[PDB]
Amino acid sequence: QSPYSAAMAEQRHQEWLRFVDLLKNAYQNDLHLPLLNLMLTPDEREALGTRVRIVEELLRGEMSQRELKNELGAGIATITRGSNSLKAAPVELRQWLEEVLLKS
Amino acid sequence: QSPYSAAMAEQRHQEWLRFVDLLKNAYQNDLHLPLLNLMLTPDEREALGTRVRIVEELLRGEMSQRELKNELGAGIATITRGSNSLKAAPVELRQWLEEVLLKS
C-alpha cells in the first residue's frame, strides 16, 4: 500500500534516544543553562565554537574570501569528515538546515 | 590607530546563546537527528551515555534498583566525583531536573 517508506536498520541504542530526547525538554524552557553548564568540561568548551562553525560554514562558508574551508591545507580537516560519513549523512542534514538558514 | 575599526557591542556571549538557540529549533520536531549525527564524534560519543548517567544517578532517590551503577570496574568516579564547578552551586539544576525526574 503506497511507499510508506521501506524498512530501516537499527541496533544497540537504548539511551541515545529515550534520554537524548529529555535533553530537548530542558532546552525548550531554556532551562538547559544548569544541565548544559553541568558537564561542560574544558575539552568541550573549545568544541562548541568549533561546532557552530561547521554549520554556519558548510552553508555560509562557500562565500568567504579569506578562504577558511576552500584552500587552507588543514581547514577541511575534520570539520566535515569527523569520523564516519559517506553519502547518507549530509543528504539528511540539508533537510533541516534548509528550514533554519533559508527559512522558505 | 583604528581609523575606522570599532566594535558594535563588544562581548561575545551572544554567539554561544544564538547558536545553541538553533539547536532547539532542530529538535522541536525531530529535525535534530541529522545535526545530531554531526555530534557522533568519538570524544562526545563517550560523553553522551555519561551525560545521562550522572543526572540519573544523582536524583536516584526514586528508589533506584538497577540504576545505581552500570560500570563498577571503572566509571563510578565520574559520578561520585563531587563539585567540579568552583561556584559549587548545582542548586541551579534541581530547578529543571526535579521536574524531569519526578514530574508532578
JSON list of C-alpha atoms in Angstrom, two decimals:
[
{"chain": "A", "resi": 1, "resn": "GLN", "atom": "CA", "xyz": [0.00, 0.00, 0.00]},
{"chain": "A", "resi": 2, "resn": "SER", "atom": "CA", "xyz": [1.82, 3.12, -1.20]},
{"chain": "A", "resi": 3, "resn": "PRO", "atom": "CA", "xyz": [5.55, 3.50, -0.48]},
{"chain": "A", "resi": 4, "resn": "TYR", "atom": "CA", "xyz": [5.03, 4.11, 3.23]},
{"chain": "A", "resi": 5, "resn": "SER", "atom": "CA", "xyz": [8.82, 4.14, 3.36]},
{"chain": "A", "resi": 6, "resn": "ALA", "atom": "CA", "xyz": [10.74, 0.85, 3.42]},
{"chain": "A", "resi": 7, "resn": "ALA", "atom": "CA", "xyz": [12.24, -0.80, 6.49]},
{"chain": "A", "resi": 8, "resn": "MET", "atom": "CA", "xyz": [15.36, 0.56, 8.20]},
{"chain": "A", "resi": 9, "resn": "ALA", "atom": "CA", "xyz": [18.19, -0.99, 10.21]},
{"chain": "A", "resi": 10, "resn": "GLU", "atom": "CA", "xyz": [18.92, -0.35, 13.89]},
{"chain": "A", "resi": 11, "resn": "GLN", "atom": "CA", "xyz": [20.93, -1.86, 16.74]},
{"chain": "A", "resi": 12, "resn": "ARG", "atom": "CA", "xyz": [22.17, -1.22, 20.28]},
{"chain": "A", "resi": 13, "resn": "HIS", "atom": "CA", "xyz": [20.81, 2.23, 21.16]},
{"chain": "A", "resi": 14, "resn": "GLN", "atom": "CA", "xyz": [18.56, 2.41, 24.23]},
{"chain": "A", "resi": 15, "resn": "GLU", "atom": "CA", "xyz": [19.78, 5.64, 25.85]},
{"chain": "A", "resi": 16, "resn": "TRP", "atom": "CA", "xyz": [20.94, 7.55, 22.79]},
{"chain": "A", "resi": 17, "resn": "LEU", "atom": "CA", "xyz": [17.19, 8.06, 22.17]},
{"chain": "A", "resi": 18, "resn": "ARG", "atom": "CA", "xyz": [14.80, 7.95, 25.13]},
{"chain": "A", "resi": 19, "resn": "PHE", "atom": "CA", "xyz": [17.29, 10.05, 27.11]},
{"chain": "A", "resi": 20, "resn": "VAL", "atom": "CA", "xyz": [18.78, 12.31, 24.47]},
{"chain": "A", "resi": 21, "resn": "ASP", "atom": "CA", "xyz": [15.14, 13.27, 24.00]},
{"chain": "A", "resi": 22, "resn": "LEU", "atom": "CA", "xyz": [14.93, 14.58, 27.54]},
{"chain": "A", "resi": 23, "resn": "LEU", "atom": "CA", "xyz": [17.80, 16.85, 26.57]},
{"chain": "A", "resi": 24, "resn": "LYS", "atom": "CA", "xyz": [15.44, 18.71, 24.25]},
{"chain": "A", "resi": 25, "resn": "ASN", "atom": "CA", "xyz": [12.91, 19.09, 27.08]},
{"chain": "A", "resi": 26, "resn": "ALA", "atom": "CA", "xyz": [15.23, 21.11, 29.32]},
{"chain": "A", "resi": 27, "resn": "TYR", "atom": "CA", "xyz": [16.22, 23.18, 26.34]},
{"chain": "A", "resi": 28, "resn": "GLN", "atom": "CA", "xyz": [12.76, 24.40, 25.23]},
{"chain": "A", "resi": 29, "resn": "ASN", "atom": "CA", "xyz": [12.19, 26.14, 28.54]},
{"chain": "A", "resi": 30, "resn": "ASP", "atom": "CA", "xyz": [15.71, 27.50, 28.15]},
{"chain": "A", "resi": 31, "resn": "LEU", "atom": "CA", "xyz": [16.25, 25.61, 31.36]},
{"chain": "A", "resi": 32, "resn": "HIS", "atom": "CA", "xyz": [19.29, 23.92, 29.91]},
{"chain": "A", "resi": 33, "resn": "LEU", "atom": "CA", "xyz": [21.61, 26.58, 31.38]},
{"chain": "A", "resi": 34, "resn": "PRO", "atom": "CA", "xyz": [22.22, 24.46, 34.51]},
{"chain": "A", "resi": 35, "resn": "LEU", "atom": "CA", "xyz": [22.22, 20.98, 32.92]},
{"chain": "A", "resi": 36, "resn": "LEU", "atom": "CA", "xyz": [24.23, 22.26, 30.00]},
{"chain": "A", "resi": 37, "resn": "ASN", "atom": "CA", "xyz": [26.80, 24.02, 32.19]},
{"chain": "A", "resi": 38, "resn": "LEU", "atom": "CA", "xyz": [26.82, 20.83, 34.31]},
{"chain": "A", "resi": 39, "resn": "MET", "atom": "CA", "xyz": [29.09, 18.64, 32.18]},
{"chain": "A", "resi": 40, "resn": "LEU", "atom": "CA", "xyz": [30.83, 21.46, 30.31]},
{"chain": "A", "resi": 41, "resn": "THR", "atom": "CA", "xyz": [34.47, 20.42, 30.79]},
{"chain": "A", "resi": 42, "resn": "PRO", "atom": "CA", "xyz": [37.32, 22.39, 29.09]},
{"chain": "A", "resi": 43, "resn": "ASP", "atom": "CA", "xyz": [37.78, 19.99, 26.17]},
{"chain": "A", "resi": 44, "resn": "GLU", "atom": "CA", "xyz": [34.11, 20.51, 25.34]},
{"chain": "A", "resi": 45, "resn": "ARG", "atom": "CA", "xyz": [34.38, 24.26, 25.84]},
{"chain": "A", "resi": 46, "resn": "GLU", "atom": "CA", "xyz": [36.80, 24.57, 22.93]},
{"chain": "A", "resi": 47, "resn": "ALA", "atom": "CA", "xyz": [34.32, 22.49, 20.93]},
{"chain": "A", "resi": 48, "resn": "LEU", "atom": "CA", "xyz": [31.05, 24.42, 20.98]},
{"chain": "A", "resi": 49, "resn": "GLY", "atom": "CA", "xyz": [32.58, 27.26, 18.97]},
{"chain": "A", "resi": 50, "resn": "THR", "atom": "CA", "xyz": [34.34, 24.82, 16.66]},
{"chain": "A", "resi": 51, "resn": "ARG", "atom": "CA", "xyz": [30.87, 23.32, 16.29]},
{"chain": "A", "resi": 52, "resn": "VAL", "atom": "CA", "xyz": [28.59, 26.20, 15.32]},
{"chain": "A", "resi": 53, "resn": "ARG", "atom": "CA", "xyz": [31.39, 26.87, 12.84]},
{"chain": "A", "resi": 54, "resn": "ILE", "atom": "CA", "xyz": [30.94, 23.81, 10.61]},
{"chain": "A", "resi": 55, "resn": "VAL", "atom": "CA", "xyz": [27.21, 24.54, 10.22]},
{"chain": "A", "resi": 56, "resn": "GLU", "atom": "CA", "xyz": [27.45, 28.28, 9.55]},
{"chain": "A", "resi": 57, "resn": "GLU", "atom": "CA", "xyz": [30.33, 27.31, 7.25]},
{"chain": "A", "resi": 58, "resn": "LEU", "atom": "CA", "xyz": [29.01, 24.43, 5.16]},
{"chain": "A", "resi": 59, "resn": "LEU", "atom": "CA", "xyz": [26.32, 26.89, 4.08]},
{"chain": "A", "resi": 60, "resn": "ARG", "atom": "CA", "xyz": [27.59, 30.43, 4.77]},
{"chain": "A", "resi": 61, "resn": "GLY", "atom": "CA", "xyz": [31.23, 29.36, 4.27]},
{"chain": "A", "resi": 62, "resn": "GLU", "atom": "CA", "xyz": [31.28, 28.91, 0.49]},
{"chain": "A", "resi": 63, "resn": "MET", "atom": "CA", "xyz": [31.19, 32.71, 0.25]},
{"chain": "A", "resi": 64, "resn": "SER", "atom": "CA", "xyz": [34.17, 33.61, 2.44]},
{"chain": "A", "resi": 65, "resn": "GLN", "atom": "CA", "xyz": [37.03, 35.47, 0.78]},
{"chain": "A", "resi": 66, "resn": "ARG", "atom": "CA", "xyz": [39.65, 34.71, 3.43]},
{"chain": "A", "resi": 67, "resn": "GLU", "atom": "CA", "xyz": [39.35, 31.05, 2.42]},
{"chain": "A", "resi": 68, "resn": "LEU", "atom": "CA", "xyz": [38.63, 29.21, 5.67]},
{"chain": "A", "resi": 69, "resn": "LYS", "atom": "CA", "xyz": [37.42, 25.92, 4.16]},
{"chain": "A", "resi": 70, "resn": "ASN", "atom": "CA", "xyz": [38.34, 26.20, 0.47]},
{"chain": "A", "resi": 71, "resn": "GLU", "atom": "CA", "xyz": [42.14, 26.40, 0.49]},
{"chain": "A", "resi": 72, "resn": "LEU", "atom": "CA", "xyz": [43.86, 26.30, 3.88]},
{"chain": "A", "resi": 73, "resn": "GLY", "atom": "CA", "xyz": [45.69, 22.97, 3.81]},
{"chain": "A", "resi": 74, "resn": "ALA", "atom": "CA", "xyz": [44.28, 21.97, 7.19]},
{"chain": "A", "resi": 75, "resn": "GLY", "atom": "CA", "xyz": [40.89, 23.68, 7.16]},
{"chain": "A", "resi": 76, "resn": "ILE", "atom": "CA", "xyz": [38.95, 20.83, 5.54]},
{"chain": "A", "resi": 77, "resn": "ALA", "atom": "CA", "xyz": [40.45, 18.60, 8.23]},
{"chain": "A", "resi": 78, "resn": "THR", "atom": "CA", "xyz": [37.75, 17.06, 10.43]},
{"chain": "A", "resi": 79, "resn": "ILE", "atom": "CA", "xyz": [35.20, 19.89, 10.29]},
{"chain": "A", "resi": 80, "resn": "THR", "atom": "CA", "xyz": [33.26, 17.89, 7.72]},
{"chain": "A", "resi": 81, "resn": "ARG", "atom": "CA", "xyz": [34.71, 14.37, 7.86]},
{"chain": "A", "resi": 82, "resn": "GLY", "atom": "CA", "xyz": [34.60, 13.91, 11.63]},
{"chain": "A", "resi": 83, "resn": "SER", "atom": "CA", "xyz": [34.67, 10.12, 11.97]},
{"chain": "A", "resi": 84, "resn": "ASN", "atom": "CA", "xyz": [32.30, 8.31, 9.60]},
{"chain": "A", "resi": 85, "resn": "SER", "atom": "CA", "xyz": [30.18, 9.90, 6.88]},
{"chain": "A", "resi": 86, "resn": "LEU", "atom": "CA", "xyz": [29.90, 8.64, 3.31]},
{"chain": "A", "resi": 87, "resn": "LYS", "atom": "CA", "xyz": [26.89, 9.67, 1.20]},
{"chain": "A", "resi": 88, "resn": "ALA", "atom": "CA", "xyz": [23.98, 9.28, 3.63]},
{"chain": "A", "resi": 89, "resn": "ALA", "atom": "CA", "xyz": [24.81, 11.70, 6.45]},
{"chain": "A", "resi": 90, "resn": "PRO", "atom": "CA", "xyz": [24.67, 15.06, 4.63]},
{"chain": "A", "resi": 91, "resn": "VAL", "atom": "CA", "xyz": [21.70, 14.16, 2.46]},
{"chain": "A", "resi": 92, "resn": "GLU", "atom": "CA", "xyz": [19.94, 14.02, 5.82]},
{"chain": "A", "resi": 93, "resn": "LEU", "atom": "CA", "xyz": [21.24, 17.39, 7.01]},
{"chain": "A", "resi": 94, "resn": "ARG", "atom": "CA", "xyz": [20.24, 19.54, 4.08]},
{"chain": "A", "resi": 95, "resn": "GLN", "atom": "CA", "xyz": [16.73, 18.54, 5.08]},
{"chain": "A", "resi": 96, "resn": "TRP", "atom": "CA", "xyz": [16.54, 20.69, 8.20]},
{"chain": "A", "resi": 97, "resn": "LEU", "atom": "CA", "xyz": [19.40, 23.10, 7.62]},
{"chain": "A", "resi": 98, "resn": "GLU", "atom": "CA", "xyz": [17.29, 24.47, 4.76]},
{"chain": "A", "resi": 99, "resn": "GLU", "atom": "CA", "xyz": [14.46, 25.44, 7.10]},
{"chain": "A", "resi": 100, "resn": "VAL", "atom": "CA", "xyz": [16.66, 27.20, 9.66]},
{"chain": "A", "resi": 101, "resn": "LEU", "atom": "CA", "xyz": [19.14, 29.08, 7.44]},
{"chain": "A", "resi": 102, "resn": "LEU", "atom": "CA", "xyz": [16.93, 29.53, 4.38]},
{"chain": "A", "resi": 103, "resn": "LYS", "atom": "CA", "xyz": [13.52, 29.63, 6.04]},
{"chain": "A", "resi": 104, "resn": "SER", "atom": "CA", "xyz": [11.35, 29.29, 2.95]},
{"chain": "B", "resi": 1, "resn": "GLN", "atom": "CA", "xyz": [45.37, 53.63, 15.29]},
{"chain": "B", "resi": 2, "resn": "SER", "atom": "CA", "xyz": [41.98, 52.23, 14.25]},
{"chain": "B", "resi": 3, "resn": "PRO", "atom": "CA", "xyz": [41.00, 54.75, 11.57]},
{"chain": "B", "resi": 4, "resn": "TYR", "atom": "CA", "xyz": [37.64, 53.00, 11.30]},
{"chain": "B", "resi": 5, "resn": "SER", "atom": "CA", "xyz": [37.90, 49.86, 13.43]},
{"chain": "B", "resi": 6, "resn": "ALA", "atom": "CA", "xyz": [35.14, 49.96, 16.04]},
{"chain": "B", "resi": 7, "resn": "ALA", "atom": "CA", "xyz": [33.17, 47.34, 17.96]},
{"chain": "B", "resi": 8, "resn": "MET", "atom": "CA", "xyz": [29.40, 47.00, 17.73]},
{"chain": "B", "resi": 9, "resn": "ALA", "atom": "CA", "xyz": [28.59, 45.88, 21.26]},
{"chain": "B", "resi": 10, "resn": "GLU", "atom": "CA", "xyz": [31.77, 44.15, 22.41]},
{"chain": "B", "resi": 11, "resn": "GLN", "atom": "CA", "xyz": [31.40, 40.93, 24.40]},
{"chain": "B", "resi": 12, "resn": "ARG", "atom": "CA", "xyz": [30.66, 37.65, 22.61]},
{"chain": "B", "resi": 13, "resn": "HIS", "atom": "CA", "xyz": [28.41, 35.60, 24.89]},
{"chain": "B", "resi": 14, "resn": "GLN", "atom": "CA", "xyz": [25.74, 36.42, 22.32]},
{"chain": "B", "resi": 15, "resn": "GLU", "atom": "CA", "xyz": [27.00, 33.68, 19.98]},
{"chain": "B", "resi": 16, "resn": "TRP", "atom": "CA", "xyz": [27.09, 30.75, 22.45]},
{"chain": "B", "resi": 17, "resn": "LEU", "atom": "CA", "xyz": [23.44, 31.63, 23.05]},
{"chain": "B", "resi": 18, "resn": "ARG", "atom": "CA", "xyz": [22.45, 32.42, 19.47]},
{"chain": "B", "resi": 19, "resn": "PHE", "atom": "CA", "xyz": [23.93, 29.10, 18.33]},
{"chain": "B", "resi": 20, "resn": "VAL", "atom": "CA", "xyz": [22.52, 26.63, 20.81]},
{"chain": "B", "resi": 21, "resn": "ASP", "atom": "CA", "xyz": [19.28, 28.51, 20.20]},
{"chain": "B", "resi": 22, "resn": "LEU", "atom": "CA", "xyz": [19.30, 26.94, 16.76]},
{"chain": "B", "resi": 23, "resn": "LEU", "atom": "CA", "xyz": [19.85, 23.54, 18.32]},
{"chain": "B", "resi": 24, "resn": "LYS", "atom": "CA", "xyz": [16.38, 23.80, 19.86]},
{"chain": "B", "resi": 25, "resn": "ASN", "atom": "CA", "xyz": [14.75, 24.62, 16.54]},
{"chain": "B", "resi": 26, "resn": "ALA", "atom": "CA", "xyz": [16.03, 21.37, 15.04]},
{"chain": "B", "resi": 27, "resn": "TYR", "atom": "CA", "xyz": [14.78, 19.32, 17.98]},
{"chain": "B", "resi": 28, "resn": "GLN", "atom": "CA", "xyz": [11.33, 20.98, 18.01]},
{"chain": "B", "resi": 29, "resn": "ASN", "atom": "CA", "xyz": [10.03, 18.27, 15.80]},
{"chain": "B", "resi": 30, "resn": "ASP", "atom": "CA", "xyz": [12.61, 15.59, 15.04]},
{"chain": "B", "resi": 31, "resn": "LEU", "atom": "CA", "xyz": [14.84, 17.66, 12.87]},
{"chain": "B", "resi": 32, "resn": "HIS", "atom": "CA", "xyz": [17.78, 17.21, 15.20]},
{"chain": "B", "resi": 33, "resn": "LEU", "atom": "CA", "xyz": [18.52, 13.68, 14.02]},
{"chain": "B", "resi": 34, "resn": "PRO", "atom": "CA", "xyz": [20.75, 14.93, 11.17]},
{"chain": "B", "resi": 35, "resn": "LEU", "atom": "CA", "xyz": [22.81, 17.52, 13.03]},
{"chain": "B", "resi": 36, "resn": "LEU", "atom": "CA", "xyz": [22.64, 15.10, 15.93]},
{"chain": "B", "resi": 37, "resn": "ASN", "atom": "CA", "xyz": [24.76, 12.77, 13.82]},
{"chain": "B", "resi": 38, "resn": "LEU", "atom": "CA", "xyz": [27.35, 15.53, 13.38]},
{"chain": "B", "resi": 39, "resn": "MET", "atom": "CA", "xyz": [27.67, 15.02, 17.12]},
{"chain": "B", "resi": 40, "resn": "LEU", "atom": "CA", "xyz": [28.75, 11.37, 16.90]},
{"chain": "B", "resi": 41, "resn": "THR", "atom": "CA", "xyz": [32.39, 12.37, 17.42]},
{"chain": "B", "resi": 42, "resn": "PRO", "atom": "CA", "xyz": [34.35, 9.75, 19.41]},
{"chain": "B", "resi": 43, "resn": "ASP", "atom": "CA", "xyz": [35.04, 12.05, 22.36]},
{"chain": "B", "resi": 44, "resn": "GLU", "atom": "CA", "xyz": [31.38, 13.05, 22.50]},
{"chain": "B", "resi": 45, "resn": "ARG", "atom": "CA", "xyz": [30.14, 9.54, 21.74]},
{"chain": "B", "resi": 46, "resn": "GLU", "atom": "CA", "xyz": [31.51, 8.51, 25.12]},
{"chain": "B", "resi": 47, "resn": "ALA", "atom": "CA", "xyz": [30.39, 11.67, 26.92]},
{"chain": "B", "resi": 48, "resn": "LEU", "atom": "CA", "xyz": [26.83, 11.09, 25.76]},
{"chain": "B", "resi": 49, "resn": "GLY", "atom": "CA", "xyz": [25.78, 7.99, 27.68]},
{"chain": "B", "resi": 50, "resn": "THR", "atom": "CA", "xyz": [27.65, 9.63, 30.56]},
{"chain": "B", "resi": 51, "resn": "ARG", "atom": "CA", "xyz": [25.76, 12.91, 30.35]},
{"chain": "B", "resi": 52, "resn": "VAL", "atom": "CA", "xyz": [22.59, 10.98, 31.15]},
{"chain": "B", "resi": 53, "resn": "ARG", "atom": "CA", "xyz": [24.33, 8.72, 33.67]},
{"chain": "B", "resi": 54, "resn": "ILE", "atom": "CA", "xyz": [25.08, 11.46, 36.20]},
{"chain": "B", "resi": 55, "resn": "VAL", "atom": "CA", "xyz": [21.75, 13.29, 36.38]},
{"chain": "B", "resi": 56, "resn": "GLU", "atom": "CA", "xyz": [20.03, 9.92, 36.70]},
{"chain": "B", "resi": 57, "resn": "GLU", "atom": "CA", "xyz": [22.31, 8.61, 39.46]},
{"chain": "B", "resi": 58, "resn": "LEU", "atom": "CA", "xyz": [22.05, 11.96, 41.24]},
{"chain": "B", "resi": 59, "resn": "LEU", "atom": "CA", "xyz": [18.31, 12.00, 41.96]},
{"chain": "B", "resi": 60, "resn": "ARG", "atom": "CA", "xyz": [18.42, 8.22, 42.41]},
{"chain": "B", "resi": 61, "resn": "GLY", "atom": "CA", "xyz": [16.26, 8.94, 45.47]},
{"chain": "B", "resi": 62, "resn": "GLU", "atom": "CA", "xyz": [13.50, 7.49, 43.28]},
{"chain": "B", "resi": 63, "resn": "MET", "atom": "CA", "xyz": [14.17, 4.02, 44.70]},
{"chain": "B", "resi": 64, "resn": "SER", "atom": "CA", "xyz": [16.86, 3.25, 42.12]},
{"chain": "B", "resi": 65, "resn": "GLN", "atom": "CA", "xyz": [17.05, -0.53, 41.88]},
{"chain": "B", "resi": 66, "resn": "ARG", "atom": "CA", "xyz": [19.26, -1.32, 38.87]},
{"chain": "B", "resi": 67, "resn": "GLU", "atom": "CA", "xyz": [20.47, 2.21, 38.09]},
{"chain": "B", "resi": 68, "resn": "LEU", "atom": "CA", "xyz": [22.89, 2.76, 40.98]},
{"chain": "B", "resi": 69, "resn": "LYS", "atom": "CA", "xyz": [25.91, 1.88, 38.84]},
{"chain": "B", "resi": 70, "resn": "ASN", "atom": "CA", "xyz": [26.48, 0.25, 35.44]},
{"chain": "B", "resi": 71, "resn": "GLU", "atom": "CA", "xyz": [30.28, 0.37, 35.34]},
{"chain": "B", "resi": 72, "resn": "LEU", "atom": "CA", "xyz": [31.82, -0.58, 38.67]},
{"chain": "B", "resi": 73, "resn": "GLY", "atom": "CA", "xyz": [35.02, -1.91, 37.12]},
{"chain": "B", "resi": 74, "resn": "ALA", "atom": "CA", "xyz": [35.67, 1.72, 36.19]},
{"chain": "B", "resi": 75, "resn": "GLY", "atom": "CA", "xyz": [33.37, 4.72, 35.76]},
{"chain": "B", "resi": 76, "resn": "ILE", "atom": "CA", "xyz": [31.87, 5.20, 39.22]},
{"chain": "B", "resi": 77, "resn": "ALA", "atom": "CA", "xyz": [34.26, 8.13, 39.62]},
{"chain": "B", "resi": 78, "resn": "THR", "atom": "CA", "xyz": [32.70, 10.44, 37.04]},
{"chain": "B", "resi": 79, "resn": "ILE", "atom": "CA", "xyz": [29.62, 10.22, 39.26]},
{"chain": "B", "resi": 80, "resn": "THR", "atom": "CA", "xyz": [30.58, 10.31, 42.94]},
{"chain": "B", "resi": 81, "resn": "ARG", "atom": "CA", "xyz": [33.22, 12.80, 41.82]},
{"chain": "B", "resi": 82, "resn": "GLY", "atom": "CA", "xyz": [31.79, 15.84, 43.61]},
{"chain": "B", "resi": 83, "resn": "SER", "atom": "CA", "xyz": [31.53, 19.55, 42.81]},
{"chain": "B", "resi": 84, "resn": "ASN", "atom": "CA", "xyz": [33.60, 20.26, 39.70]},
{"chain": "B", "resi": 85, "resn": "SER", "atom": "CA", "xyz": [32.37, 23.85, 39.47]},
{"chain": "B", "resi": 86, "resn": "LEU", "atom": "CA", "xyz": [34.28, 26.39, 41.55]},
{"chain": "B", "resi": 87, "resn": "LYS", "atom": "CA", "xyz": [30.94, 28.05, 42.27]},
{"chain": "B", "resi": 88, "resn": "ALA", "atom": "CA", "xyz": [29.87, 24.85, 44.00]},
{"chain": "B", "resi": 89, "resn": "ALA", "atom": "CA", "xyz": [26.19, 25.62, 43.48]},
{"chain": "B", "resi": 90, "resn": "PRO", "atom": "CA", "xyz": [24.36, 22.96, 41.44]},
{"chain": "B", "resi": 91, "resn": "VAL", "atom": "CA", "xyz": [21.14, 24.14, 43.08]},
{"chain": "B", "resi": 92, "resn": "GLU", "atom": "CA", "xyz": [20.54, 25.65, 39.65]},
{"chain": "B", "resi": 93, "resn": "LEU", "atom": "CA", "xyz": [19.93, 22.15, 38.33]},
{"chain": "B", "resi": 94, "resn": "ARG", "atom": "CA", "xyz": [17.45, 20.96, 40.91]},
{"chain": "B", "resi": 95, "resn": "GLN", "atom": "CA", "xyz": [15.24, 23.52, 39.21]},
{"chain": "B", "resi": 96, "resn": "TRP", "atom": "CA", "xyz": [14.59, 21.62, 35.98]},
{"chain": "B", "resi": 97, "resn": "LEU", "atom": "CA", "xyz": [15.77, 18.18, 36.97]},
{"chain": "B", "resi": 98, "resn": "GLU", "atom": "CA", "xyz": [13.33, 17.98, 39.88]},
{"chain": "B", "resi": 99, "resn": "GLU", "atom": "CA", "xyz": [10.68, 18.50, 37.19]},
{"chain": "B", "resi": 100, "resn": "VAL", "atom": "CA", "xyz": [12.10, 15.95, 34.70]},
{"chain": "B", "resi": 101, "resn": "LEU", "atom": "CA", "xyz": [12.97, 13.04, 37.00]},
{"chain": "B", "resi": 102, "resn": "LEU", "atom": "CA", "xyz": [9.80, 13.26, 39.09]},
{"chain": "B", "resi": 103, "resn": "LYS", "atom": "CA", "xyz": [7.39, 15.49, 37.17]},
{"chain": "B", "resi": 104, "resn": "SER", "atom": "CA", "xyz": [4.29, 16.49, 39.12]}
]
